[PDB]
Amino acid sequence: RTREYTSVITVPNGGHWGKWGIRQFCHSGYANGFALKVEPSQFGRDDTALNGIRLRCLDGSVIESLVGKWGTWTSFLVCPTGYLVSFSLRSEKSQGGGDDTAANNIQFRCSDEAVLVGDGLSWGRFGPWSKRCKICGLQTKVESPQGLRDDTALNNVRFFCCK
Secondary structure, X not given: OOOOOOEEEOOOOOOOXXXXXXXXXXXXXXXEEEEEEEOOOOOOOOOOOOOEEEXXXXXXXXXXXXXXXXXXXXXXXXXXXXXXXXXXXXXXXXXXXXXXXXXXXXXXEEXXXXXXXXXXXXXXXXXXXXXXOOEEEEEEEEEOOOOOOOOOEEEEEEEEEOO
């Protein structure tokens, strides 16, 4: 890895199908905001999944990891004061085969205790909060990124922590 980190923060819900992308980090400091690549809040088009998470680092740099090709990017949701420290994922439960457990939405906790809920899909439930640390990078697991709107979905995400 280029930037050094002390640990990885993960959550227990969230899919297992897809390929992990490249690990991206803020050049300096931590991230204090995020945006999402989601499909416009319209009706008819069957529900699918998030196609990406993108963080803003207090040093104006923006990072994402592996992104899907569908949906549009929302404006950023920024920390009132600190930086991001913990995240929770919204996902439906599954079964043996149909592992419908892609990530539907995400909410973060900032260092000042503010909670920022992404404006995503609202199907499923928020699972437990990951542990807390100073978020400086991320890595995304996306199923068929270049695929059809059909099975392209961000399945999981993990963030890296810095000193």
